[PDB]
Amino acid sequence: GCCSDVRCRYRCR
Cβ contacts of residue 12 below 8 Å, gap of 6+? 2, 3
Do 11 and 5 contact (CB within 8 A), yes or no? no
Do 12 and 2 contact (CB within 8 A), yes or no? yes
Between the alpha carbon of residue 13 and those of residues 1, 3, 10, the distances in Å are: 11, 9, 6
Do 8 and 2 contact (CB within 8 A), yes or no? yes
Distance CA 12, CA 8 (A): 6
Cβ contacts of residue 8 below 8 Å, gap of 6+? 2
Distance CA 6, CA 4 (A): 6
